[PDB]
Amino acid sequence: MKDVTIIGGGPSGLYASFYAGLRDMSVRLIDVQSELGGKMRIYPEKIIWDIGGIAPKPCHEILKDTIKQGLYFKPEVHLNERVVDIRKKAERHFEVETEAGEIYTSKAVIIAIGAGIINPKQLDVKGVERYQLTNLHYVVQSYRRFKDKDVLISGGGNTALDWAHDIAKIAKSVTVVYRKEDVSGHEAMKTLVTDLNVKLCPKTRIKYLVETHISEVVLEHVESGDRHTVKFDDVIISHGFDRCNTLLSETSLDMHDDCRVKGFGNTTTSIPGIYACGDIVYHDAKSHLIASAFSDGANAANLAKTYIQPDANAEGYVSSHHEVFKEANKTIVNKHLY
């Protein structure tokens, strides 16, 4: 039987998997996506600067190292599987059940689900390669950059309609492309419907993206198939993250008022043996950063080790002098593999 089941294969679950492996714990890692990476799979070409110790480079470059790290100790990885229920039969005996009816047993459970199911949209770039695009945005934080710009937003989700309203305050025009039939979310539209500079284009998708910036967008109607090319200055692809729509409403934990797992000072949850790491947990030391997802992962692995084996050391051995790496260290130095 596996020592710990980690729910979520994002940076927090990946690092949690690594650090649990460093402490000689058996790990099962489950993620709903077809590939590991979590939210990092949404913005692969964007350059990340705020990860500690990592010189700026594409997210997809950093992700390859981070995935490898999560798998140093080679855990049992289960992709394309969606957890739907968590059960505590007894102390050090948990059942994790998927939607397909698969039941996995573990002595502890680490919940690293971020904000819920992530399903990155597959963008098709023509003329240029996606990796050199600069004016392609997957999140809006500062929006002063959109002054007098023609902005395209893909998706009719609540988040996309909220973005559209914020951007409309200073943008010249906003076009919201989505398919379905009519928008998702009543409240976002009542706010949005009074933005007289927002054009709604239902049943329409972004087809192709046409130096170092997107210059034109081919939009295409889902039914007729008619295409027309519109020039834009910035493109924003939403995905629709909505906390409060996770598995955590129907499992049987104390919840923060914003639908984050309430962390009791750290990654400790309201059930001994269940620990939450990453964006999903709230404690006073949390940041919405990859750096915090990592430090959360370590704490969840540490607390789970001492949960399974109370007399074990509180923390793991520093890797610089850890005996398991000694064989590899000689090869790295002799061959200059860095």
Ligand X SMILES: Cc1cc2nc3c(=O)[nH]c(=O)nc-3n(C[C@H](O)[C@H](O)[C@H](O)COP(=O)(O)OP(=O)(O)OC[C@H]3O[C@@H](n4cnc5c(N)ncnc54)[C@H](O)[C@@H]3O)c2cc1C
Among 6, 108, 115, 133, binds ligand X (CB under 6 A): 115
Pick the closer one to ligand X by CB: 138 or 232. Answer: 138
Residue 18 in contact with its own copies, rule: CB under 8 A: yes
Number of residues that bind its own copies (CB under 8 A): 83
Among 90, 314, 318, 337, binds ligand X (CB under 6 A): 318
Pick the closer one to ligand X by CB: 90 or 318. Answer: 318
> In the bound complex, what is the minimum distance in angstroms from residue 41's beta carbon to ligand X?
7
Which segments are annotated as binding site for FAD?
A: 12, 31, 39, 43, 83, 118, 279, 320
Pick the closer one to its own copies by CB: 175 or 266. Answer: 266
- Residues 73, 196: Cα–Cα separation, whole Å: 56
Which positions ≥6 away from 71 have C-beta within 8 Å? 14, 17, 18, 77
Among 74, 147, 186, 288, binds its own copies (CB under 8 A): 288
Per-residue contact flags (x/-) with ligand X for residues 118 to 147, judged by CB under 6 A: x-------------------xx--------
Residue 113 in contact with ligand X, rule: CB under 6 A: yes
Pick the closer one to its own copies by CB: 83 or 174. Answer: 174
13 binds, among its own copies, ligand X, none (CB under 5 to 8 A by kind): ligand X
